[PDB]
Design a binder for this molecule. Structure first.
Ligand SMILES: Cc1ccccc1S(N)(=O)=O
Ligand SMILES: Cc1ccccc1S(N)(=O)=O
Ligand SMILES: Cc1ccccc1S(N)(=O)=O
Ligand SMILES: Cc1ccccc1S(N)(=O)=O
Ligand SMILES: O=C(O)CNC(=O)C(=O)O
Ligand code: NI
Ligand SMILES: [Zn+2]
Length: 331
């Protein structure tokens, strides 16, 4: 078996290899990339997402989210407090202010140390889940707004036509902005392009070991666990690499820089943080191998987890028994 230690693999496709998205994902998996839960793809030197990022300051962040932590330095939850709208230009200025700017540091490792030591004592503001794209319409390869849809994949594989659409989302981050431990909706893949700015550090648990992380989370967040059988779907829980090591949870880490893609694989739990002002674009996607994961995906039915409209059809077709209880939850 390829990649038995479940290491994060890094790929450097040629421009010829970059022409067929589906084929390249399949190639990565033939090399065992999915076993890690996460892969990095560095695009060919000839490729570009767009010409420049010069005129993005007028994008609106309608609902910036202040990420307020509770708990201990290595085991905490965060909740999102809504703030007044601001443009990307205003947000960038805020990110760079004395209150919010990245502190002096020696290297990525030093910054990582500072993040886990001090994250809980600050409340950075994140511009997350903004529908839109920064890919030039003329960028034909790996354009996250031009991927085959999950609905079309499910139709190709299962012969059923369903309603729904899926489109990309933009994320504007600053120092300490955090993504909590989670897998994707329906345990889909995700792909994430860092368009500009400072890096993003990722942590990931191999899909074959996801239940180990779930068991630890139930122990560390006992009230949350009693409230919901799939509370990680709420996307609020953080556990540090030190705490993971102390509890024998297998995981890896890698830092993504501007101009690089990351792919998360079905049922690959991931979490992370931004180093400073940045902008990423991400979208979910599927392949034939996803279908079996979609059929088995846990669901939140306590009401907390947000459902896109399109998730309805996925649950209805792949999980008809659960459909009753789940739909009562989102209503
Ligand atoms: C950038 C480039 C240039 C020539 C052929 C193909 C490409 S690609 N696949 O878009 O990266
Ligand atoms: C609020 C909090 C804080 C730290 C650990 C666990 C929790 S929770 N959501 O009560 O399980
Ligand atoms: C538990 C821990 C904590 C920090 C560094 C290393 C470890 S260990 N003994 O390698 O799992
Ligand atoms: C023990 C160790 C050390 C470094 C990175 C990851 C691990 S773990 N918890 O074995 O995956
Ligand atoms: O970038 C972020 O804040 C979170 N991104 C993801 O979880 C993803 O791309 O799957
Ligand atoms: Ni994700
Ligand atoms: Zn729930």
């Amino acid at each position: 078996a390829q990649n038995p230690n479940c290491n994060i693999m890094i790929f450097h496709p040629t421009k010829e290899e970059f022409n067929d998205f589906d084929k390249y994902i399949a190639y990565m998996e033939s090399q065992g990339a999915h076993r890690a839960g996460l892969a990095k793809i560095i695009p060919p030197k000839e490729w570009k997402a767009r010409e420049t990022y010069d005129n993005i300051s007028e994008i609106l962040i309608a609902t910036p989210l202040q990420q307020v932590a509770s708990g201990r330095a290595g085991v905490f939850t965060q909740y999102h407090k809504k703030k007044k709208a601001m443009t990307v230009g205003e947000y960038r200025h805020l990110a760079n202010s004395k209150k919010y700017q990245t502190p002096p540091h020696q290297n990525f490792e030093d910054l990582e140390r500072k993040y886990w030591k001090n994250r809980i004592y600050n409340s950075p503001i994140y511009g997350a889940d903004i529908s839109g794209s920064l890919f030039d319409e003329n960028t034909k390869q790996w354009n996250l707004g031009h991927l085959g849809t999950i609905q079309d994949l499910l139709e190709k594989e299962c012969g059923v036509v369903i309603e729904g659409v899926n489109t990309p989302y933009l994320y504007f981050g600053m120092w300490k902005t955090t993504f909590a431990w989670h897998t994707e909706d329906m345990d889909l893949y995700s792909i994430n392009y860092l368009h500009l700015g400072e890096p993003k550090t990722w942590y990931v648990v191999p899909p074959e070991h996801g239940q180990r992380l779930e068991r630890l989370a139930r122990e560390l967040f006992p009230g949350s666990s009693r409230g919901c059988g799939a509370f990680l779907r709420h996307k609020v829980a953080l556990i540090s690499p030190t705490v993971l090591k102390e509890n024998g949870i297998p995981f890896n880490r890698i830092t993504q820089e501007a101009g690089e893609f990351m792919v998360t694989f079905p049922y690959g739990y991931h979490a992370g943080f931004n180093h400073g002002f940045n902008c990423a674009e991400a979208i979910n996607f599927a392949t034939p191998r996803w279908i079996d994961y979609g059929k088995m995906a846990s669901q939140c039915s306590c009401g907390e987890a947000r459902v896109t409209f399109s998730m309805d059809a996925f649950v209805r077709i792949l999980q008809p028994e659960r459909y009753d209880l789940w739909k009562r939850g989102q209503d």
